[PDB]
XYZ file of C-alpha atoms in Angstrom:
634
model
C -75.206 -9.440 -61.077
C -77.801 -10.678 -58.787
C -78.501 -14.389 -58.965
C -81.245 -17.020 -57.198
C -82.593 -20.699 -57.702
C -86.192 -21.440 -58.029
C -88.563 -24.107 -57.811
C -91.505 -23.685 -60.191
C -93.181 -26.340 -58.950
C -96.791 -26.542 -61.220
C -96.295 -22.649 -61.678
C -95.741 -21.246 -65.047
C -94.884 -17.581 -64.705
C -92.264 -15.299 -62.736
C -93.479 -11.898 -62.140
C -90.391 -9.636 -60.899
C -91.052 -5.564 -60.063
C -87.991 -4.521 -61.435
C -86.125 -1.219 -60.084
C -83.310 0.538 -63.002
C -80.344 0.556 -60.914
C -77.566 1.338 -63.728
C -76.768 3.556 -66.493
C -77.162 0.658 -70.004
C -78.963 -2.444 -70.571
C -81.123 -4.538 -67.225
C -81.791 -7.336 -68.282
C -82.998 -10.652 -66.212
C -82.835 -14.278 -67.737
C -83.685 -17.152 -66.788
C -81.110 -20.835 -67.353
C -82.065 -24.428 -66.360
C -80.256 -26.705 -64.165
C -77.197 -27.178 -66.560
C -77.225 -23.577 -67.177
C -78.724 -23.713 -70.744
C -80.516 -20.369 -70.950
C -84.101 -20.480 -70.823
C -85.167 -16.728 -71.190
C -83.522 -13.436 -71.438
C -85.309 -9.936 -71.081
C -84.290 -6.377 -71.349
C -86.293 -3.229 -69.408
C -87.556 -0.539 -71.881
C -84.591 2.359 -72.700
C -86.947 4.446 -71.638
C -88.349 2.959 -67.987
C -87.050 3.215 -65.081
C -89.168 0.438 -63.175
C -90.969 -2.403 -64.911
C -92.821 -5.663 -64.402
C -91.450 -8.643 -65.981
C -93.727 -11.656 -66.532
C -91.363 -14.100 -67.838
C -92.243 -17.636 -68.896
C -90.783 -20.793 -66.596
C -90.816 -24.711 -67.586
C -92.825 -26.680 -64.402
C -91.144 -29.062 -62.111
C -87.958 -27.519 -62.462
C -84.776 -25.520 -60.911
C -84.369 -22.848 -62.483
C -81.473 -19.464 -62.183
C -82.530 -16.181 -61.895
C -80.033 -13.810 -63.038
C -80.619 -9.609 -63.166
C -78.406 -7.284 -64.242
C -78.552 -3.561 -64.247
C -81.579 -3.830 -62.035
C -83.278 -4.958 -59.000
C -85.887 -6.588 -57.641
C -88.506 -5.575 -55.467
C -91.412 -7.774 -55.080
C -91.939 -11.106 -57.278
C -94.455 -14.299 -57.362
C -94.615 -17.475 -59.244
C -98.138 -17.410 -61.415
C -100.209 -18.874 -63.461
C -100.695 -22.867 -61.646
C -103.717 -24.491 -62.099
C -106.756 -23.406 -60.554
C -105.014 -20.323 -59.568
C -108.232 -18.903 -57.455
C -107.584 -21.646 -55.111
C -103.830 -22.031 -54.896
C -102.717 -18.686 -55.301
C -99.254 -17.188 -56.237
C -96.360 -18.439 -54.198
C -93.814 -15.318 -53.214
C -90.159 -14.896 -54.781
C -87.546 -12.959 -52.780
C -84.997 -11.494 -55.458
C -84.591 -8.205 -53.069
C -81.037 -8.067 -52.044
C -82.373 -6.083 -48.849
C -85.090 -8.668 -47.762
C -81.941 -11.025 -46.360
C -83.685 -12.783 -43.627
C -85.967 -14.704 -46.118
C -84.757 -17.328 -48.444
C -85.458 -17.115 -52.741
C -88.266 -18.943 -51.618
C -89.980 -18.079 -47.743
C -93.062 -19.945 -46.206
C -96.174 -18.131 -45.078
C -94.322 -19.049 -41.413
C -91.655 -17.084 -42.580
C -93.219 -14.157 -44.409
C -95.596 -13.471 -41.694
C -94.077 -15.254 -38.186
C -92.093 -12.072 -37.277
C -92.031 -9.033 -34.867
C -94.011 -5.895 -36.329
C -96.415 -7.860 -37.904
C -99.556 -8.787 -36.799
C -101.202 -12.475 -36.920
C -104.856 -12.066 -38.176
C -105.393 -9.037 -40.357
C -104.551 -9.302 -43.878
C -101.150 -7.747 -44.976
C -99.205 -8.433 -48.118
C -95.784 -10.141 -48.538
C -94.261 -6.833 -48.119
C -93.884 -3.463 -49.184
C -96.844 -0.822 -49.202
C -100.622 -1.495 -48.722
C -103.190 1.062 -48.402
C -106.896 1.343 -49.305
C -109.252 -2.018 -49.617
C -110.461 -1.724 -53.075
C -113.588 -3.604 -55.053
C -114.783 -5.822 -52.697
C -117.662 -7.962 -53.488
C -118.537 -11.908 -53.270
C -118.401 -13.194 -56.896
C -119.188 -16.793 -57.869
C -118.752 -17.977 -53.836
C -115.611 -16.004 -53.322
C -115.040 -12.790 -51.147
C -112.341 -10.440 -53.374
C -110.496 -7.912 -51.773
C -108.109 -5.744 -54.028
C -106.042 -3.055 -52.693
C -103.996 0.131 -53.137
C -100.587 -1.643 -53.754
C -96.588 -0.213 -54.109
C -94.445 -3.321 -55.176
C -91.229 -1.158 -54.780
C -90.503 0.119 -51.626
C -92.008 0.412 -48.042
C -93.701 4.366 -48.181
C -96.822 5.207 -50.656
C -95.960 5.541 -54.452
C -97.314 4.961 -57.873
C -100.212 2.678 -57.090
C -100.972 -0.483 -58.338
C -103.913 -2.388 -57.571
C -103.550 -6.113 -55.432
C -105.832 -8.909 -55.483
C -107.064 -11.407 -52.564
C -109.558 -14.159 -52.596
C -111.084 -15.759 -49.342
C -113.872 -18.116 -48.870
C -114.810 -17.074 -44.941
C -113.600 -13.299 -44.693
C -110.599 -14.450 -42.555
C -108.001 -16.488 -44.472
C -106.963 -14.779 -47.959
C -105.449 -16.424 -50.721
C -102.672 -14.194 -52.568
C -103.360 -13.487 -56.256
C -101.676 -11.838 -58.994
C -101.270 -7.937 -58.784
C -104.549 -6.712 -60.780
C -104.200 -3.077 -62.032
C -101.286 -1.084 -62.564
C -99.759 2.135 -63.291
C -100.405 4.467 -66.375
C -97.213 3.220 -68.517
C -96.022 6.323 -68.784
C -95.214 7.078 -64.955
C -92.467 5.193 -65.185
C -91.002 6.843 -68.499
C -91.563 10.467 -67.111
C -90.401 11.036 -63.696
C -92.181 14.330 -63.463
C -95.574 13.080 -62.719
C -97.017 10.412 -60.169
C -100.011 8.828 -59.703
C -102.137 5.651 -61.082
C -104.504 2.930 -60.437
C -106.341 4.582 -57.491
C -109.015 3.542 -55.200
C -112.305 1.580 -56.855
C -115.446 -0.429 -56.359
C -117.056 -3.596 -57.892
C -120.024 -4.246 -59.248
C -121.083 -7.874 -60.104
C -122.818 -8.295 -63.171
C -123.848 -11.229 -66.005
C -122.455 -11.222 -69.669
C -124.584 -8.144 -70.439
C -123.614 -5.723 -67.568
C -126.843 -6.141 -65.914
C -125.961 -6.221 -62.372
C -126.822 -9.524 -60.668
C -126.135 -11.324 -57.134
C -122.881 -12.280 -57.134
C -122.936 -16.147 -57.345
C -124.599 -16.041 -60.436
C -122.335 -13.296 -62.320
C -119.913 -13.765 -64.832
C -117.272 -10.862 -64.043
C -116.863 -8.361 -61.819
C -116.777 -4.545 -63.141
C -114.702 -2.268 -61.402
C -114.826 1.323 -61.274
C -111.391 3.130 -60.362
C -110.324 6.389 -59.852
C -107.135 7.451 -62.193
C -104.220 9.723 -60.853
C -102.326 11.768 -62.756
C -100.114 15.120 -61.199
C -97.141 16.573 -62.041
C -94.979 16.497 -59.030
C -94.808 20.066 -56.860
C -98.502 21.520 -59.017
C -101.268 20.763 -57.000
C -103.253 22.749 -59.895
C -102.370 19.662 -62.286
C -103.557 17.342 -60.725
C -106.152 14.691 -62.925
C -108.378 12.426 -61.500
C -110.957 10.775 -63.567
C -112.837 7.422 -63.319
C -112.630 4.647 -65.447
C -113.818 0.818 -65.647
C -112.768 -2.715 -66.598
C -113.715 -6.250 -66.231
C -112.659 -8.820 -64.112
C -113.881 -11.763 -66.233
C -112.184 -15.183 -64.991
C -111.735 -14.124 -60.906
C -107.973 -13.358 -61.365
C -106.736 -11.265 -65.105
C -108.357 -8.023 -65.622
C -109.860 -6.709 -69.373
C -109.576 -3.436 -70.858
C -109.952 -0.693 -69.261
C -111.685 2.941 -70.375
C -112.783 6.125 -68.954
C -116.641 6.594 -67.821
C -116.818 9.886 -65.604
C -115.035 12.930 -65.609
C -115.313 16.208 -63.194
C -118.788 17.808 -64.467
C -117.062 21.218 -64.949
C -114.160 23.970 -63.203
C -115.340 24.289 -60.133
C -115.252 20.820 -59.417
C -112.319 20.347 -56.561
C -109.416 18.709 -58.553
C -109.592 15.959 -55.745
C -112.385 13.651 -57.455
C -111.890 10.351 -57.095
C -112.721 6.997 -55.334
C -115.999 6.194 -57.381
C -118.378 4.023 -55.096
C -121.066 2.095 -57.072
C -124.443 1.241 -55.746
C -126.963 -0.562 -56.887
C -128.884 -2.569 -54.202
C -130.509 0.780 -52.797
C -134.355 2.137 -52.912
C -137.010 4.527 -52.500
C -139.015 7.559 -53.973
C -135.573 9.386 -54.719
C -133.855 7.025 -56.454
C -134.509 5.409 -60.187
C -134.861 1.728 -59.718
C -133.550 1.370 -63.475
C -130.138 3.669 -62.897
C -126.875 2.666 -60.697
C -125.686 5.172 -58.453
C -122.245 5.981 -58.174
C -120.618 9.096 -55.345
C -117.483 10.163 -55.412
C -114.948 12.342 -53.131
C -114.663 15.878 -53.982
C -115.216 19.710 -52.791
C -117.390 21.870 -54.174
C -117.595 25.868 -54.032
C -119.689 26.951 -51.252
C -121.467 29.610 -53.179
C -123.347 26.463 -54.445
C -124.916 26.454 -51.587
C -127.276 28.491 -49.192
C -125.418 31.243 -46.742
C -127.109 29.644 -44.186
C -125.854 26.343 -45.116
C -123.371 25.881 -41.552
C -126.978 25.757 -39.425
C -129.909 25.000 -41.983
C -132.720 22.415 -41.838
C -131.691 21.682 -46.081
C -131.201 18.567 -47.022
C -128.195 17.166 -48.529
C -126.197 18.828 -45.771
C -124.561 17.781 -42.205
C -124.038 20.642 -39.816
C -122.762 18.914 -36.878
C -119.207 20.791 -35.947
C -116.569 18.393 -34.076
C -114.731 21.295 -33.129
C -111.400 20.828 -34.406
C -109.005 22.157 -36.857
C -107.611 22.287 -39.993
C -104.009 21.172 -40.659
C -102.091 18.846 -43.439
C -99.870 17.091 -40.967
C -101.438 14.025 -38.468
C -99.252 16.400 -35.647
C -99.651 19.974 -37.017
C -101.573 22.370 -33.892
C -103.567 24.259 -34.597
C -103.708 27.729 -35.975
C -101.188 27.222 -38.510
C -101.968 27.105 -41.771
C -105.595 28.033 -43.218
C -107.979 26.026 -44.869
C -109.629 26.829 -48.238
C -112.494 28.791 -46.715
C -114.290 28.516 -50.774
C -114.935 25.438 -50.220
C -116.882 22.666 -48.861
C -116.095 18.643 -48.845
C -118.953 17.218 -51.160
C -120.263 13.908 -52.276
C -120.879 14.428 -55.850
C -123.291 11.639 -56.998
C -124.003 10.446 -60.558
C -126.368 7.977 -62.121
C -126.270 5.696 -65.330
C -128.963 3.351 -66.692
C -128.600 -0.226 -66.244
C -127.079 -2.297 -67.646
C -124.124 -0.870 -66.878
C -122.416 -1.517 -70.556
C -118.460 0.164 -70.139
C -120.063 2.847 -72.851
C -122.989 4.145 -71.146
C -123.217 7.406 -69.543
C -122.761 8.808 -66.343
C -125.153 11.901 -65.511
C -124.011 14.138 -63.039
C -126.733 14.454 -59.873
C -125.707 16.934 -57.878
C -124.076 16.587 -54.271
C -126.100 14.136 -52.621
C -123.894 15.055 -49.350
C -121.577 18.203 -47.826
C -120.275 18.253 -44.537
C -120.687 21.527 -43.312
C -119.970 21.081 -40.458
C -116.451 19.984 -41.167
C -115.784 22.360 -44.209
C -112.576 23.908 -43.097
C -111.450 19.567 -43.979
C -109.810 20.025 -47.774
C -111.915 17.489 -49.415
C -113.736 13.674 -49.066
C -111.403 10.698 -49.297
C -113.185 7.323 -50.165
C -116.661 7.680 -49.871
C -120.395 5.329 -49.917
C -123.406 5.387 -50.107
C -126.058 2.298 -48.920
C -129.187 1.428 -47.252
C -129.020 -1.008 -44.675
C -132.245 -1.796 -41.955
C -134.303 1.123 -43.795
C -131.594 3.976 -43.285
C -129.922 5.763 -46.164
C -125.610 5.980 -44.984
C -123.222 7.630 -46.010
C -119.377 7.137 -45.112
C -116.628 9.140 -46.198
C -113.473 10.750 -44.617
C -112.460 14.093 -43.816
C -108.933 15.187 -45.405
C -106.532 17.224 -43.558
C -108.704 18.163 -40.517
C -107.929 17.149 -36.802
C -111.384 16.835 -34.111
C -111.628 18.552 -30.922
C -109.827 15.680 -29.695
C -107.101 15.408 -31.851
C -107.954 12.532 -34.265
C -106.021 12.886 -37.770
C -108.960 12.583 -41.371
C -111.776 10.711 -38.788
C -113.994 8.499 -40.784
C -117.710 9.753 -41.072
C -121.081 8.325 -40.989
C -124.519 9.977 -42.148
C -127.611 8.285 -41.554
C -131.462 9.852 -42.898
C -133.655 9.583 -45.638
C -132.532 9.555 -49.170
C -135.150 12.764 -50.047
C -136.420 13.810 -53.695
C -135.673 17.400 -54.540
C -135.388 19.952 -57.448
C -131.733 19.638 -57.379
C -131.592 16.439 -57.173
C -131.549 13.492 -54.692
C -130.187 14.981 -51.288
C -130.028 12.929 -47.818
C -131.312 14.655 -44.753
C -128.662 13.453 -42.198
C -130.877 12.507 -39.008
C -127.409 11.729 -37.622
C -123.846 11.564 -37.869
C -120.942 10.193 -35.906
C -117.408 8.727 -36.133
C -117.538 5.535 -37.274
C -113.933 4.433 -34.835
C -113.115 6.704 -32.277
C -109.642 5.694 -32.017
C -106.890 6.482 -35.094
C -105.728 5.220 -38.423
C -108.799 3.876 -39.144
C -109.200 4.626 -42.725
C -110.246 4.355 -46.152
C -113.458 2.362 -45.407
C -115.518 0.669 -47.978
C -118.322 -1.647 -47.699
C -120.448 -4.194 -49.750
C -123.562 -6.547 -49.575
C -123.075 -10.330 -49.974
C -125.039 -12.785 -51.112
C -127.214 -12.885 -48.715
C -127.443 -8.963 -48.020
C -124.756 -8.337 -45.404
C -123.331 -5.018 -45.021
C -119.699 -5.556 -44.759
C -117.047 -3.080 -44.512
C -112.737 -3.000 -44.239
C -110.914 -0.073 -43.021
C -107.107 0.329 -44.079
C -105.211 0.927 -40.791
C -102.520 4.126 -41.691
C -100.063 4.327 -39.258
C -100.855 7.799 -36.960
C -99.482 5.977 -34.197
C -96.026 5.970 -35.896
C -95.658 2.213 -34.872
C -94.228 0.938 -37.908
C -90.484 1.524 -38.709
C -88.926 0.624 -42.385
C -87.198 -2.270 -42.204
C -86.547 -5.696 -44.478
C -89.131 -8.790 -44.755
C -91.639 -5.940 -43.589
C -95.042 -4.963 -44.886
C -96.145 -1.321 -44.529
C -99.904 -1.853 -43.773
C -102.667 -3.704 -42.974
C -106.878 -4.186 -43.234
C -109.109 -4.024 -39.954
C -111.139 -7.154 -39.330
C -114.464 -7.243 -41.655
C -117.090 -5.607 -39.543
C -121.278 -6.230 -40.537
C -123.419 -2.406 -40.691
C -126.393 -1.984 -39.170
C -128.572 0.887 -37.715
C -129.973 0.932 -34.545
C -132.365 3.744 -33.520
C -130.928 5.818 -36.331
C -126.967 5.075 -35.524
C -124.507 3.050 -37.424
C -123.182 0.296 -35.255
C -120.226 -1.811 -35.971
C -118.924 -5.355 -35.152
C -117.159 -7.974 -36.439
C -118.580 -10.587 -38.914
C -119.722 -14.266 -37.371
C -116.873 -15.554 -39.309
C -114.185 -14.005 -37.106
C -115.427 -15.014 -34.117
C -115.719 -18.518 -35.559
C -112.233 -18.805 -37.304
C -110.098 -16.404 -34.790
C -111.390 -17.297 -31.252
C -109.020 -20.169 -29.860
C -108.835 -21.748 -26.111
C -109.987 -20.113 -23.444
C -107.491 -18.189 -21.003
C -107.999 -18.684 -17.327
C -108.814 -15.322 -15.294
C -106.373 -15.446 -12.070
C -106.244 -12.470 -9.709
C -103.579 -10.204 -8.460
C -105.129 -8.634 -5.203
C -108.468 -6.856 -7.135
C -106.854 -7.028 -10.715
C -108.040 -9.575 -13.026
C -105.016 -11.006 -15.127
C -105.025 -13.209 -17.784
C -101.864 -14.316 -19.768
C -102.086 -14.012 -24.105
C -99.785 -16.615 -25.517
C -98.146 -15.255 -28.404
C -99.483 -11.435 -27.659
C -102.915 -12.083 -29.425
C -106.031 -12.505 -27.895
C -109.777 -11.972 -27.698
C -111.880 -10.233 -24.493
C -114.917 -9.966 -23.774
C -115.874 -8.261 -20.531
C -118.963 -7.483 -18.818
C -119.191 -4.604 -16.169
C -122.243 -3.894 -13.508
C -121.863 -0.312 -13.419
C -120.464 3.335 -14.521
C -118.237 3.191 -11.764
C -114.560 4.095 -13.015
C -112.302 1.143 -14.435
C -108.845 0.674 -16.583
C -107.660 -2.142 -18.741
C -104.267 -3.108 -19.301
C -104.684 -4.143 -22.793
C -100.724 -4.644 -24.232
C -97.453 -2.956 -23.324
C -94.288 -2.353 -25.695
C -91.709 0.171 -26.560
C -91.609 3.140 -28.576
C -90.071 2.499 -31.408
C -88.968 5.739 -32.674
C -87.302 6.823 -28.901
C -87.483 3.273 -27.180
C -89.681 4.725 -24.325
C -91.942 2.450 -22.654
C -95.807 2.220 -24.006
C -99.227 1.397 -22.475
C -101.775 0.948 -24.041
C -104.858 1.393 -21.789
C -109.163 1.408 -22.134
C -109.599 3.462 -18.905
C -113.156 5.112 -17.777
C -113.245 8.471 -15.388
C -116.186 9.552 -14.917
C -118.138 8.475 -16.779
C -116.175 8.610 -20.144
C -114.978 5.923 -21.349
C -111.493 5.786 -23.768
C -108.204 4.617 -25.008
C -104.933 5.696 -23.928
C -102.055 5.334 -25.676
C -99.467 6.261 -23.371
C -95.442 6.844 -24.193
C -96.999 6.870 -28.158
C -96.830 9.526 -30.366
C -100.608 10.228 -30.012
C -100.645 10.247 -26.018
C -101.983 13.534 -26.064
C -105.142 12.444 -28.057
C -108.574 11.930 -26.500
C -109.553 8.802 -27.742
C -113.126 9.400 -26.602
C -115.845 6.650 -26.954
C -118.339 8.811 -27.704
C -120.911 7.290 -25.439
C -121.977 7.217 -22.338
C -123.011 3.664 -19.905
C -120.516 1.297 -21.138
C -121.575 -2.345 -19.876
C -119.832 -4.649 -22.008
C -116.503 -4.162 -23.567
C -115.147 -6.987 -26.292
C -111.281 -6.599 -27.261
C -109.652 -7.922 -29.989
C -105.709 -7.790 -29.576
C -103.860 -8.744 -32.781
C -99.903 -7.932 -31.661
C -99.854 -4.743 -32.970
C -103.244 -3.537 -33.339
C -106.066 -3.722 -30.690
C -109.667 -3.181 -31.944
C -112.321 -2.657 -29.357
C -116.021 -2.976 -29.476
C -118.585 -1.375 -26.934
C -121.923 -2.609 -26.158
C -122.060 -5.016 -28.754
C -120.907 -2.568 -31.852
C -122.892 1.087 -30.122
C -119.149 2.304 -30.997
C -116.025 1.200 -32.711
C -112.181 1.728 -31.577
C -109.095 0.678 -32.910
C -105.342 1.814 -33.604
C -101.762 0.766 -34.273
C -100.047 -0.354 -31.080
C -97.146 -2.460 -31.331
C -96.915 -4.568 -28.004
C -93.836 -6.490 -27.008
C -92.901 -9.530 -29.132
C -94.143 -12.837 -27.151
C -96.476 -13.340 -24.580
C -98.885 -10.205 -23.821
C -101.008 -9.712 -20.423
C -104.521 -8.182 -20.152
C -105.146 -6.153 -16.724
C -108.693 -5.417 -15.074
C -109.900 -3.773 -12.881
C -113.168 -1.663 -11.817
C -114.359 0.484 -9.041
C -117.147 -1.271 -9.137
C -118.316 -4.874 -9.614
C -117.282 -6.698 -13.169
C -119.716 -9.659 -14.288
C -117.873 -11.758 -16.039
C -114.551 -12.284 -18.248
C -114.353 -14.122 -21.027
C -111.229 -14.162 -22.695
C -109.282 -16.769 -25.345
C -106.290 -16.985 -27.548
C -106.402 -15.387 -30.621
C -105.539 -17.642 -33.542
C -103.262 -16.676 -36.641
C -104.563 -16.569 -40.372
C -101.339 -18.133 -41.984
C -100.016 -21.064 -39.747
């Protein structure tokens, strides 16, 4: 029997995420001060894990007894104004030891492994950023979510609200798993990735200040465990109607036919996009799949079609982030695809979804299984496409790369097609994944990335969350390209003092309090250069790492040394590198080169304390401007 005191405070609901840990009854309950029992609940015979929402008098001490059963992940609930104040965290994990019934933000978030700016949960397992949006003057993040332990499982869907991008406010957990994945331990899945769509009290899509809920379309899971042949994925939607509780939810798109890939899922919905291929009265929606390549032209590798990429990054197929190449074969039938449908506005949770055809294959890349987490905008008069590549490694050894197309969204007989003018990575370093984007109020193109851990810097442990988001980064295109950079609002909120530049006989060193800073750095030539960005330790052998941006010859990349990815070639992908701005977060660094021309960023755990950036050039640097980085909790 498991016991803790809480403090409700003006909270009137404790969630627990409940493990089955014995053989009969679990049951929690709940006793005032005197020990007068307040509330007693049993987990379902027939679940094995369950989520308790249990009611709890305010301004009081109460006892938190479980039996049977253990605790995971837990919040007090249900204050007033509960967009604003948030849940407060409840530690009822016998493993999570360092942290009191009750921790701080200082004490959730103050601690080695973690970093101090990009948004993490309390603990446990994060992945993909999911239906983000602005919605009556609030930015909403939701994410891929597993209360229970520190490794991917049955997902669940979190929920974060922020008024300036940077600072998030913790909110109930939103979606959850099919009820029966917890009564049948033979299948896994649920509440997969999804988008959001603003829209008034008749599903007409408006701005997002002046909407009444936010619709959400999700991808389902359901696969019996060791069949990849049974594996269902279908889309569905529901309503976020108050900013916090979601509404019913009910299925809207299913694969069109058989030769659909199984893999179908992570439904992007856009409606803010134009021109003669497009019906200004429908919403379009793409999702991830593979398609047979007999659907399309023999020719299709090096064609002039539309609705095809052909550029070949010249690596290799493999399930593994480490797996060499040669070893096991792709599906050679088959061909990662966009598939894009269409439904008439308003979009009413009963209207139908018409199947359009693959607006986008890769081609190029279709030894990858299948698309992960796709999108589809128009941002300064360019049609874009995003999406990742599953299973497939570059030339230079980069694990599921995320893609960008850029063209013209083209009318055909087939249906709309874009004719990729272009296509790149959109981060050339690793882990960068699971992007999705959105337009705010005032027509930004903002997008978060989920950063998986390739690197292998994070090691299970208590008090520990297993993932994190990338900083929000504004899309536009340049001369046809995508370019990437962080959003005014992290520059305003993150950058702190300024760092004074002393030098070491030709290096440049400045000294980052608290192993989190900001660079920006200016050079005068091509000449060859290295940066010293953070040092640590290995923490799977204890070797020492570097972690370097270093230019020879002319190329310009990270190095990870002593990591498990030293041997990748974390090319740039450009050539004349002037100014180079660093972002340094602890554990993850996140570079941007000539102003946003190319994105890099990765998992690097430096040493716990004060960090040290190193420069130093072959030729002349400009200037150096660097400052402290400042935290998003304390």
């Amino acid at each position: 029997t498991y016991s803790i005191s809480v403090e409700t405070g003006g909270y009137r609901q404790l969630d627990l995420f409940a493990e089955r840990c014995g053989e009969g009854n679990a049951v929690v309950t709940v006793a005032d001060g005197n020990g007068v029992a307040i509330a007693a609940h049993t987990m379902p015979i027939a679940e094995r894990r369950h989520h308790f929402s249990i009611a709890v008098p305010q301004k009081s001490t109460v006892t938190v007894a479980a039996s049977g059963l253990v605790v995971r992940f837990g919040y007090l609930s249900e204050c007033d104004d509960l967009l604003d104040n948030g849940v407060r965290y409840v530690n009822m994990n016998p493993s999570d030891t360092d942290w009191p019934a009750q921790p701080t933000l200082e004490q959730i978030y103050n601690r080695f492994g973690r970093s101090g700016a990009h948004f993490e949960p309390f603990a446990r397992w994060m992945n993909d950023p999911n239906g983000l949006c602005q919605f009556q003057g609030r930015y909403h993040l939701f994410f891929q979510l597993n209360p229970y332990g520190f490794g991917w499982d049955n997902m669940h869907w979190g929920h974060a609200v922020s008024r300036d991008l940077v600072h998030w406010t913790h909110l109930p957990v939103f979606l959850e798993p099919q009820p029966e994945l917890h009564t049948d331990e033979r299948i896994v899945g649920g509440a997969f990735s999804g988008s959001a769509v603003t829209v008034d009290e008749h599903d007409n899509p408006v701005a997002g200040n002046e909407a009444n809920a936010i619709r959400l379309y999700l991808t389902r899971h359901l696969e019996t465990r060791g069949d990849e042949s049974s594996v269902t994925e279908y889309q569905t939607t529901c309503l976020c109607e108050d900013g916090v509780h979601v509404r019913v939810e009910s299925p809207v798109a299913l694969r069109a036919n058989d030769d659909f890939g199984y893999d179908f899922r992570d439904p992007k919905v856009e409606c803010g996009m134009g021109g003669e291929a497009l019906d200004p009265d429908r919403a379009y929606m793409v999702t991830a799949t593979n398609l047979p390549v007999s659907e399309f032209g023999a020719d299709a590798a090096d064609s002039a079609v539309p609705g095809i990429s052909t550029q070949n990054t010249g690596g290799w197929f493999t399930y593994s982030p480490q797996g060499k190449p040669g070893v096991d074969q792709p599906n050679n039938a088959t061909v990662p695809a966009m598939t894009l449908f269409s439904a008439k506005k308003p979009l009413k949770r009963n209207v139908t979804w018409r199947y359009e055809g693959p607006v986008l294959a890769d081609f190029g890349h279709q030894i990858a299984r299948t698309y992960e987490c796709p999108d589809l905008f128009q941002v300064d008069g360019v049609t874009v496409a995003v999406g990742a590549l599953m299973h497939y490694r570059d030339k230079q050894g980069r694990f599921q790369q995320v893609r960008w197309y850029a063209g013209d969204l083209v009318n055909t007989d087939n249906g709309p097609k874009l004719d990729v003018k272009a296509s790149d990575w959109c981060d050339f370093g690793t882990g960068y994944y699971a992007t999705q984007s959105f337009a705010d109020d005032n027509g930004r193109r903002i997008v978060f990335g989920w950063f998986t851990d390739f690197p292998e810097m994070r090691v299970e442990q208590p008090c520990l969350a297993n993932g994190m988001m990338s900083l929000p980064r504004e899309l536009h295109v340049r001369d046809g390209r995508l370019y990437s950079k962080p959003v005014s609002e992290v520059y305003r909120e993150l950058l702190g003092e300024r760092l004074a530049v002393h030098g070491d006989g030709g290096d440049m060193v400045v000294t980052a309090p608290g192993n989190a800073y900001y660079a920006n750095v200016h050079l005068a030539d091509d000449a060859d250069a290295i940066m010293v960005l953070a040092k640590g330790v290995n923490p799977q052998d204890g070797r020492p790492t570097e972690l370097l941006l270093q230019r020879t010859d002319g190329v310009t990349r990270l190095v990870a040394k002593g990591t498990a990815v030293e041997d990748v070639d974390f090319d740039s992908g450009i050539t004349d590198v002037r100014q180079v701005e660093v972002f340094f977060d602890r554990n993850v660094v996140e570079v941007f080169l000539n102003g946003g021309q190319t994105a890099g960023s990765m998992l690097f755990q430096g040493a716990d304390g004060d960090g040290e950036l190193r420069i130093a050039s072959s030729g002349k640097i400009d200037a150096v401007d660097a400052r402290a980085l400042n935290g998003i909790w304390r």
